[PDB]
Each structure stands twice: as structure tokens, then as C-alpha cells.
Tab-separated table of C-alpha atoms and ligand atoms in Angstrom:
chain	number	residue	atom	x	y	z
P	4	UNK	CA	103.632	110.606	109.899
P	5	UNK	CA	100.765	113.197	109.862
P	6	UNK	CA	99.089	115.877	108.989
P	7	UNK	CA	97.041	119.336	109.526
P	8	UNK	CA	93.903	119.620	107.833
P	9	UNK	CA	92.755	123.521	107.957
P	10	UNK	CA	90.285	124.902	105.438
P	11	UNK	CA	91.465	123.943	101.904
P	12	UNK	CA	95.004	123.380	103.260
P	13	UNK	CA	97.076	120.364	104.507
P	14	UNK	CA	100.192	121.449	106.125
P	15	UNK	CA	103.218	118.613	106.398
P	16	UNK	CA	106.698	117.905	107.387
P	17	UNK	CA	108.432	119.395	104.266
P	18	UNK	CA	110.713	115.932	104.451
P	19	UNK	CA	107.363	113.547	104.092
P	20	UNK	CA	105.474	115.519	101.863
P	21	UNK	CA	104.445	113.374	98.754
P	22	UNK	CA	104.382	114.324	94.899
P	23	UNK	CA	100.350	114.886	95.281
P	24	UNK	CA	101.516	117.968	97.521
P	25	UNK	CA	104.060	119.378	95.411
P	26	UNK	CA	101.374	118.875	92.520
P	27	UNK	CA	99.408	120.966	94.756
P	28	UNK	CA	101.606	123.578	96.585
P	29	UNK	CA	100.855	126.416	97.824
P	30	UNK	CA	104.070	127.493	100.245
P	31	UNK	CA	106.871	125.499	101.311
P	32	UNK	CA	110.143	126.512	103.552
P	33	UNK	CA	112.909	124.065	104.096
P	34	UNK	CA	114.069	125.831	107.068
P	35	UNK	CA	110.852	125.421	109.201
P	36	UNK	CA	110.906	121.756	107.715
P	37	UNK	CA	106.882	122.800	106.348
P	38	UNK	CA	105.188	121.980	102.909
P	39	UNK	CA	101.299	123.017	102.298
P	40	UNK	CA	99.010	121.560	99.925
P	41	UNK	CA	95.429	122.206	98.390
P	42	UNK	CA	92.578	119.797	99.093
P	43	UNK	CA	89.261	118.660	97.394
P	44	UNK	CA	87.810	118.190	101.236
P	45	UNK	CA	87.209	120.821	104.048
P	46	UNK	CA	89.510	120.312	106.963
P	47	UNK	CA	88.448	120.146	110.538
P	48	UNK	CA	91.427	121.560	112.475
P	49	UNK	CA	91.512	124.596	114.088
P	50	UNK	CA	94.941	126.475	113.897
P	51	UNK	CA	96.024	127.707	117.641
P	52	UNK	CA	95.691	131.484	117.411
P	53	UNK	CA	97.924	131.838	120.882
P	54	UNK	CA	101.281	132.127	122.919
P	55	UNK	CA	100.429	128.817	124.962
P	56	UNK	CA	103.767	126.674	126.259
P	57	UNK	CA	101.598	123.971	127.800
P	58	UNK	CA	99.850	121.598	125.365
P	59	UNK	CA	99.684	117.683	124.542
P	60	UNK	CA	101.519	116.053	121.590
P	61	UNK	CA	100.917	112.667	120.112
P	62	UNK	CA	104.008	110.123	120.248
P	63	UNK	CA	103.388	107.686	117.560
P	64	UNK	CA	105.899	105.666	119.009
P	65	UNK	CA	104.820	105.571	122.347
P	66	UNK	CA	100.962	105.307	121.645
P	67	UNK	CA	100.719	107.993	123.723
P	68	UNK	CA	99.483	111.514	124.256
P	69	UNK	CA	101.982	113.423	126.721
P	70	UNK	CA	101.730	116.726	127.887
P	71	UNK	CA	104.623	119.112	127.689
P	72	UNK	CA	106.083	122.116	128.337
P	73	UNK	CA	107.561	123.825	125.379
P	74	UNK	CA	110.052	126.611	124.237
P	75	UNK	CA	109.309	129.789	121.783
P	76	UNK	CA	109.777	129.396	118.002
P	77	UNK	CA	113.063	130.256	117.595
P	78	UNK	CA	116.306	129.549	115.368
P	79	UNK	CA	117.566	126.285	117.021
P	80	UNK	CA	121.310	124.416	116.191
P	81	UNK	CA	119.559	120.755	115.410
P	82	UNK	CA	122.123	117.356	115.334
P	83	UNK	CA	121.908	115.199	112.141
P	84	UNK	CA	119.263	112.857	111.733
P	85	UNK	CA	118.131	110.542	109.068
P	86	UNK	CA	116.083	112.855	106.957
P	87	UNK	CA	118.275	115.841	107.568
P	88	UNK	CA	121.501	117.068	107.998
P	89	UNK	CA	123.121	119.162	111.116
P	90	UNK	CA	121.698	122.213	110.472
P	91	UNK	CA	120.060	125.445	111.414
P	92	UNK	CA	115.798	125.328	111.807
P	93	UNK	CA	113.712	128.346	112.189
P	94	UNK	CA	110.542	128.572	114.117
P	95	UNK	CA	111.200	125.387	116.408
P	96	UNK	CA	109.947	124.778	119.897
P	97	UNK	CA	111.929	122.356	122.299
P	98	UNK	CA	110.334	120.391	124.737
P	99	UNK	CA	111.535	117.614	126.668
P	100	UNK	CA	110.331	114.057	125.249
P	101	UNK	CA	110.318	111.183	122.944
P	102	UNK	CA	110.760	111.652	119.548
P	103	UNK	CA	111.970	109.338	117.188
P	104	UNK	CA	112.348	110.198	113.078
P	105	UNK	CA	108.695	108.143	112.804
P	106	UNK	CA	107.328	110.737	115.047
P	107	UNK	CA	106.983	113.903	112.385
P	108	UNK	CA	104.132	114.792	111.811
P	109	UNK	CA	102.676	114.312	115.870
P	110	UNK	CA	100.308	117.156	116.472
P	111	UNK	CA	100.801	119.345	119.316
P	112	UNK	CA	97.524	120.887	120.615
P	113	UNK	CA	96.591	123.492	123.031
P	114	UNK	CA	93.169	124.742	124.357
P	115	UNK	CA	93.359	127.277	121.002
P	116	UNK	CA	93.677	124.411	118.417
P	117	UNK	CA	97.412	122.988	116.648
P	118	UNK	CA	99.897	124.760	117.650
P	119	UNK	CA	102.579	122.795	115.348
P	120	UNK	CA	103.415	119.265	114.264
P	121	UNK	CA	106.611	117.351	115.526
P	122	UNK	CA	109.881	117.862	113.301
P	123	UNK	CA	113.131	117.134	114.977
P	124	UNK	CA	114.409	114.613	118.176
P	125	UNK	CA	117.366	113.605	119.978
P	126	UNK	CA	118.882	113.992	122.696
P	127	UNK	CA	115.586	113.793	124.799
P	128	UNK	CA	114.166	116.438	123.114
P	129	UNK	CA	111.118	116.180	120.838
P	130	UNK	CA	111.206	119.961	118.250
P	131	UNK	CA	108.194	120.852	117.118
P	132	UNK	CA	107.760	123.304	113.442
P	133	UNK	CA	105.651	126.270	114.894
P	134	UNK	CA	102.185	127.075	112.645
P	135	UNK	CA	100.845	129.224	114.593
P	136	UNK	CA	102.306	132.188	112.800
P	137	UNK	CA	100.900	131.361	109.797
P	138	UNK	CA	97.724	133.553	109.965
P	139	UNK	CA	96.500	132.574	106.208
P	140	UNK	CA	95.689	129.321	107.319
P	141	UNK	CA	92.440	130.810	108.673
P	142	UNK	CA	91.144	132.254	105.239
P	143	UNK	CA	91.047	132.235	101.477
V	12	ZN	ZN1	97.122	128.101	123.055
């Protein structure tokens, strides 16, 4: 599980968002596996504004903070797993690590700020859905 809290926005794994999000939505994309919702509350989170590979994501099931090396967002093949079907995802990063389905939602962080939250695993491979694109985050 997890969670980005930016401004008036909390961005999710599309899969895990709840019915409070979808009461609040403002976009959601099935392909990049991303919902965002409204909130009361300010956030705290500062969106990575960047073209960083490097960073450290959290591993719920590890307890652990590991620092990777990870791919561009791009159009990855991903295997089935047991919130989604073999299928195509757009704006994934691959890096090489432990990921498990209890893992979404792991923030990956750079020196700029989140750079995405984790999405897919297998294989030894953690995916993580890219936000970093998202420039609205910042405003509005
Ligand atoms: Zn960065």
C-alpha cells in the first residue's frame, strides 16, 4: 500500500484505489496503473521535477529502503499477477529488486522529490508507474 500526497491531490495505484477516491477523482489511466483523488488536507510531497535513474524505494516487504538504478518510462510487456492480467503498461521504469503484489504503492524518491510509486514485480524486477510527467501536480 501507499500513497502520494501533493497539494490537494493523492495519487494511487489505480488497482488499490478505494471508493472515497473514485468519489473524488480527478484523472485516472489504467494503463499507467494511476488513480488521483481530491483531499480536505494539504500534502507534503514534493513531485520530482527531473530525469534522475538513481533514487531509493521503500520495500514494504523487506522493511527496507534500497537504492536502485532504474530504467526510462516506457511501454513495458508485464507477466500476470494477482491484481492484473499479462498486459501492456505505459510509463514504467524497471529496476532490479524485490517486489511483491503488497509492495504498490512503495515510493521511489530522488534528490528532486517522488519520482513514482511501485506498480508491477516479478521476475526480480520491482516496475515503478512514472509521475513525474504529470506537471499539474504542482498547481491548481
Ligand atoms: Zn531526480
Amino acid at each position: 500500500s501507499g500513497a502520494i500526497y501533493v497539494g490537494n491531490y493523492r495519487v494511487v495505484n489505480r488497482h488499490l484505489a478505494t471508493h472515497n477516491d473514485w468519489a473524488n477523482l480527478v484523472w485516472e489511466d489504467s494503463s499507467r496503473d494511476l488513480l488521483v483523488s481530491s483531499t480536505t488536507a494539504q500534502g507534503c510531497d514534493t513531485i520530482a521535477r527531473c530525469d534522475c535513474q538513481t533514487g531509493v524505494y521503500y520495500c514494504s516487504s523487506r522493511r527496507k529502503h534500497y537504492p536502485v538504478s532504474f530504467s526510462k518510462p516506457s511501454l513495458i510487456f508485464v507477466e500476470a499477477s494477482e491484481y492484473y492480467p499479462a498486459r501492456y503498461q505505459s510509463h514504467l521504469m524497471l529496476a532490479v529488486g524485490h517486489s511483491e503484489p503488497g509492495d504498490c504503492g512503495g515510493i521511489l524518491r530522488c534528490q528532486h522529490g517522488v519520482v513514482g510509486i511501485v506498480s508491477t514485480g516479478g521476475n526480480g524486477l520491482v516496475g515503478f508507474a512514472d509521475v513525474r510527467d504529470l506537471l499539474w501536480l504542482d498547481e491548481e
